Design a protein around this ligand. Structure first.
Ligand SMILES: [F-]
Ligand SMILES: [F-]
Lengths: 444, 441
């Protein structure tokens, strides 16, 4: 196989100029789409705040329009899903993972407007769900759309522009080019066999995406956490312990999401009307909570900087974790459109923060900042539930810019994946793609 | 399909034996890396103490500089030609080859040869990098524990071979991420599926890196400080720089390939002419290493000086040209040692130089030449080696200027794109190719 290799080695990294140029087009569109989705979600969150001020006096009246406003956007969001694109329910990452395995269709004439407007409903409603879901799926669909439209032939191209769309989609959601590129080549591409995905092409797509997000979102980070302290070698072992804690919690959380998926399916049975109604119910609870306890609802990015800063009481940190596990499960396992990726960042941060606080009081010889532990914890549920540690690590890095915590981040994440393996849990995105592929055979 | 459904449910279940064994490879590679590194510096130190003992007679001191290196160089080329020829050059093509199951991992021979061979050429003050030694030694250690413990399986032969080379790049740069990424972007078999456990390579890189940190904490290899940000209206300049690196990459690639041949003439393959040529080249490096230290050595000392704009335009043009020369000479001569880091110094100098032109041409941009230095620093890597992802994340891990991530990515990508469009190849892949073809011929 030697002579073939020599031929192959000499022909390496020669992506067809067509695919390279098209990567740039996919990037650019995904980016603008992502920017819009973001700007849309923000506008609805804002009109909702403008309603609570038009009725800021009558608390029971105000507690009502807080509920209804979400409920309507929730329902409308669930409705676009169940009626026109069932594949746009849930995250949007198993579905494009499916598409990379050539085992799920990319119906872009339906998913684009369903994911976009349906997500705009759930997120803009104030539900506990992340933009990644929508942007990744949207991005890949936009990937497919420019494939079809220019009728590019080849396996390389289909897989490439599909992958580029998802990577440009993740990048634009977090202002995280490296994490987008990495996510594809760690999680997203097909895991069990070879593929022809030009990394350089995913690259170009991602760049263009990130430049578009930059044209419209310059000067304000999603997460400013400032420059935290260092970690001395004698402190490293504590991070292993935090990893192990995520590691056994990872799989447990995974069960609750799959389990809740089932338990919630009972309530509506498949029925579009019960389902939509159950959507406005969960939706409204979030709009409500988003007023009376805003750290238990929404994206959770706001409470990231706070937990890292030490401005939360252990009691509040325990409250926020428990509550959010509850609302994360409700919002995602109910099948609304939207990711579960970003909400795992908040759950991560909170849990680590609290660990840091206990680490500070038990160990003053160490000179701890509980904030280093929050930051090692932020990508850690990503590690133990999604089993994409290399991506959560680089993603947290890009968002928090605390490179001195590298060793700490890597060790925590790693400890989490190891214990997630060892206690019999599985990558959450893969376990979802599976039940969906298996239902695509059970009813046959 | 039903195959897939059973695959997804079984995903990321690396055999515990492979995981525990990664820990030991990483540790052994970390230790070995450290030892290699302290060895090199010690010898570099001695040579500095010999120039002090004779610091009066200028033509005498020029001599003992030449000789101390010449001898060490000779001892280095010697250990390779005599006991382990697969430990000539960089060492990455070889391990790549190994992972393709097309080259042998003779660890009983490569470990001591690459270690002491590297010790000589590097410690003598030649323009080479510790990666070659450390990645090869690390892969070889990986095979070594695999043999010794008799681990059967393709996954085990491919994983432990990989975690060893990642751990050895991590340890030579204090870049745990770049270690990991180099495996997935460049080292792994590029044209077919492989069962290499990413989680396991990770573990090896952690243990490797920790070892290095036990013995090298509190000092970084490159400190550059915090540089300015890069305005959107400033981004197109980085595209241009990457274009410049993109056309030069392939040309420089030809030159390393050709100089390999043109030096292979001088000695014909003969151990004595070869080891002698070695001491001339090494002698030249210990000599330049005193009269103009910027033209010789690893190159790390001038990167901060270049980034802080503390060189003149002329002094940069010189240093660059001077290094193109002493880089080809040192590495195309077959001396044990990587070409990977000497590209970092090259990429930095070109950048700074481009940066300085930008400053005087566009005062409206409020530019800092150091930002082009950092964008360029991993750009030659992108152009010649064609691992832009590993380049970018490596420079990030060493320079800590993340606000330059767009400019760095843009320049690097403009580098790979133009390298491809001008017919250049992945230099590591071109070398493994050359070696596999000269095999079956
Ligand atoms: F998700
Ligand atoms: F090299």
């Amino acid at each position: 196989r030697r002579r073939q290799l020599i031929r192959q080695l000499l022909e390496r990294d020669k992506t067809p100029l067509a695919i390279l140029f098209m990567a740039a087009v996919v990037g650019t569109l995904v980016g603008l789409a992502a920017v819009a989705f973001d700007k849309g979600v923000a506008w609805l969150q804002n009109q909702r705040m403008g309603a609570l001020v038009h009725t800021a006096d009558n608390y029971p009246l105000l507690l009502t329009v807080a509920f209804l406003c979400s409920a309507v956007l929730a329902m409308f969001g669930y409705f676009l899903v169940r009626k026109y694109a069932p594949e746009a329910g849930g995250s949007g990452i198993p579905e494009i993972e499916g598409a990379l395995e050539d085992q799920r269709p990319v119906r872009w004439w339906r998913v684009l407007p369903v994911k976009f407007f349906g997500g705009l409903g759930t997120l803009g409603g104030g539900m506990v769900l992340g933009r990644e879901g929508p942007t990744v799926q949207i991005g890949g669909n936009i990937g497919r759309m420019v494939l079809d439209i220019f009728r590019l032939k080849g396996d390389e191209a289909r897989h490439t522009l599909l992958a580029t769309g998802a990577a440009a989609g993740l990048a634009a959601a977090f202002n995280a080019p490296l994490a987008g590129i990495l996510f594809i080549i760690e999680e997203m591409r097909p895991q069990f066999r070879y593929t022809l995905i030009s990394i350089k092409a995913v690259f170009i797509g991602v760049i263009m995406s990130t430049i578009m997000y930059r044209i419209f979102n310059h000067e304000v980070a999603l997460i400013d956490v400032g420059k935290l302290s260092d970690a001395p070698l004698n402190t490293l072992w504590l991070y292993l312990i935090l990893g192990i804690i995520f590691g056994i919690f990872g799989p447990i959380f995974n069960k609750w999401v799959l389990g809740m998926q089932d338990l919630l399916h009972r309530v509506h049975g498949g029925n579009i009307t019960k389902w939509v109604l159950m959507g406005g119910a969960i939706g409204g609870l979030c709009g409500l909570l988003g007023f009376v306890a805003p750290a238990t609802s929404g994206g959770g990015f706001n409470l990231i900087p706070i937990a890292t800063a030490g401005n939360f009481s252990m009691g509040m940190l325990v409250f926020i974790f428990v509550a959010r596990v509850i609302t994360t499960l409700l919002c995602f396992s109910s099948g609304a459109p939207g990711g579960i990726f970003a909400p795992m960042l908040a759950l991560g941060t909170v849990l680590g923060t609290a660990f840091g606080m206990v680490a500070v009081e038990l160990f003053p010889q160490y000179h701890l900042e509980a904030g280093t532990f929050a930051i090692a914890g932020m990508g850690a549920l990503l590690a133990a539930s999604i089993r994409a540690p290399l991506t959560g690590i680089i993603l947290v890095l890009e968002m928090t810019d605390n490179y001195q915590l590298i060793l700490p981040m890597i060790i925590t994440g790693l400890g989490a994946t190891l214990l997630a393996q060892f206690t019999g849990g599985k990558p959450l995105y893969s376990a979802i793609l599976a039940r969906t592929l298996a239902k695509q055979e059970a009813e046959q």
